[PDB]
């Protein structure tokens, strides 16, 4: 019986905020992934949160990568207005991401709950395969401040006082002229790209401090959205290398390897950097040149994310990071 902490402050101070609580797990072997099917009493969503089955291109590396059109369950592949229509009905969302070497798979489970349930949902249980997990809500004595290493921090609207706060981002795959995210990538990083080698359309949705209204990325006139964009794309490998007990970095960087996405591809659509040892970097991403978000799972591989060259690349699905915000204490 594991535990996941949902951090509730005493008050919310208006705003349609959702709280996020996530925790990682001890691992399981490689080929066990498909067995994982979660049950819950606090998924609460209309068959959309837990029942996330997605067409992936499993890249089994050997030796030598093997692309296979596989189907995965429980991933954090989010959809348009998912958080929103979850909020209006006071229902929840839950997903998990994976960091996998050639042999093992460390999970990371996020749960997203509207703040309208810091009192109703005081405790809960959710089971994922070999692990039960009690979802424990936990009150801090903060009014609305997020608890950051002993102090209650409160954005915004003010000398100025400013700190760095945690933020969780998930990619939402939506198609339309207004979602050409790679165009913003080019306009704000001066990489040598164009619109055909990079066609995936979508955006990111993020929550800050475990209690915040969602932040869409990118939007030009949002201070926090552009902060998140800078953070996400200056470290797409995730701004937290160290998973639960991986400070002594043993990255057997095996090296670059090509793969098809999907398996039926005529040539190699994705470049990767195979590794082994300790799984710390996430293993779920999305292929870039495909208009449809053709999701990719890569065990024992760091997919190519550096967009210095604008072809045969991938973008992360989830991302946990830190960005700068103005606040107050006492």
């Amino acid at each position: 019986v594991y535990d996941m902490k949902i951090e509730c402050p005493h008050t919310v101070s208006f705003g349609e905020n959702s709280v996020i609580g996530y925790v990682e797990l001890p691992p399981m072997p490689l080929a066990d992934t498909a067995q994982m099917v979660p049950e819950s009493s606090c998924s609460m969503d209309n068959h959309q949160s837990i029942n996330t089955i997605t067409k992936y291109t499993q890249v089994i590396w050997r030796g030598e990568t093997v692309s296979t059109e596989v189907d995965l369950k429980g991933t954090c592949v989010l959809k348009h207005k998912m958080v929103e229509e979850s909020y209006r009905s006071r229902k929840s969302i839950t997903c998990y991401d994976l960091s996998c070497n050639s042999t093992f798979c460390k999970p990371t489970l996020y749960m997203i709950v509207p703040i309208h349930a810091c009192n109703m949902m005081k405790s809960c249980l959710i089971a994922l395969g070999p692990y039960r997990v009690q979802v424990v809500y936990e009150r801090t004595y903060c009014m609305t401040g997020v608890l950051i290493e002993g102090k209650c921090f409160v954005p915004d609207q003010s000398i100025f006082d400013i700190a760095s706060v945690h933020v969780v981002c998930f990619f939402v795959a939506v198609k339309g002229n207004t979602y050409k995210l790679f165009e913003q990538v080019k306009k704000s990083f001066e990489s040598t790209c164009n619109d055909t080698e990079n066609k995936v359309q979508g955006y990111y949705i993020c929550i800050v401090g475990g209690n915040s209204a969602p932040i869409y990325v990118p939007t030009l006139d949002d201070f926090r959205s552009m902060e998140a964009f800078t953070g996400i794309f200056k470290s797409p490998h995730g701004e937290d290398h160290d998973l639960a007990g991986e400070e002594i970095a043993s990255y057997s960087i095996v090296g670059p390897a090509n793969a098809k996405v999907p398996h039926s591809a005529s040539s190699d659509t994705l470049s990767l950097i195979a590794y082994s040892g300790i799984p710390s970097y996430s293993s779920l991403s999305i292929l870039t040149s495909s208009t449809d978000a053709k999701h990719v799972f890569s065990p024992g591989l760091f997919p190519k994310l550096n967009h210095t060259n604008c072809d045969k690349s991938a973008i992360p699905l989830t991302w946990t990071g830190m960005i700068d915000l103005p606040g107050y204490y006492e």
Partner: antibody, heavy 124, light 110 residues
């Protein structure tokens, strides 16, 4: 690429019920989360939004035409439909279907993309 | 048409042509404006959303803005192919719907 396409009879006689159907392509209609909308435009005149429906069944009609407008949905077949009852010579217009979106949390804000429209003329 | 647009605006290439859209607190005071360009006898096309944002394939000649209950579309650097009809749209809560402006017939003279 995502495209919307309208279909229906070009002529509908007075005091009938007018039915039109918009079909989505490129995007899965259940991956939408969008406000699927009917808008019209009288000849030489401006624009007027008829109504919208969500992928669940939320019927949000214009107060002027909520008496007459009905909007069908078909999630299993990627379609939605408009049914304007009690049509007269006033309702002759170009009818467009649109994928209205709402950026953040507030309701309908913009329409992207558009179907290329269909001209429904009314005359006995 | 609850949103009030000027009927016609005009200019010559190289201008800064601005198109207006005035409503009340119930429509533009609390919700975003989107801007649409309709070419001669054609289906409309999104130009601005969220009051200033640009779709892909939209030139920053077209910028937008909104203050209080009134919005503007600024074509900074007018060009020949901009001879069309420009509509503004926003959500009105007291009417619980989406409202358009009267359109703006833009003429490129010279």
């Amino acid at each position: 690429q995502v495209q919307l396409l309208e279909s229906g009879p070009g002529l509908v006689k007075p005091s009938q019920t007018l039915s039109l159907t918009c079909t989505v392509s490129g995007d899965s209609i259940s991956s939408g989360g969008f406000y699927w909308s009917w808008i019209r435009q009288h000849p030489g005149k401006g624009l007027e939004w008829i109504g919208y429906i969500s992928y669940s069944g939320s019927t949000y009609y214009n107060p002027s035409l909520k008496s007459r407008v009905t909007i069908s949905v078909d999630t299993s077949k990627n379609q939605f439909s408009l049914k304007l009852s009690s049509v007269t010579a006033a309702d002759t217009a170009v009818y467009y279907c649109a994928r209205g979106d709402s950026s953040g949390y507030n309701p309908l804000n913009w329409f992207d993309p558009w179907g290329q429209g269909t001209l429904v003329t009314v005359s006995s | 048409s609850v949103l009030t647009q000027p009927p016609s605006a005009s200019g010559t290439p190289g201008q800064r042509v601005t198109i207006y859209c005035s409503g009340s607190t119930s429509n533009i005071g609390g919700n975003t404006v989107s801007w649409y360009q309709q070419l001669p006898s054609m289906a409309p096309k999104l130009l601005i959303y969220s009051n200033d944002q640009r779709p892909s394939g939209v030139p920053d000649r077209f910028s937008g803005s909104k203050s209080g209950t009134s919005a503007s579309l600024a074509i900074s650097g007018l060009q020949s192919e901009d001879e069309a009809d420009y509509y503004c749209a926003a959500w009105d809560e007291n009417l619980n719907g989406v409202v358009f402006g009267g359109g703006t017939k833009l003429t490129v003279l010279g």
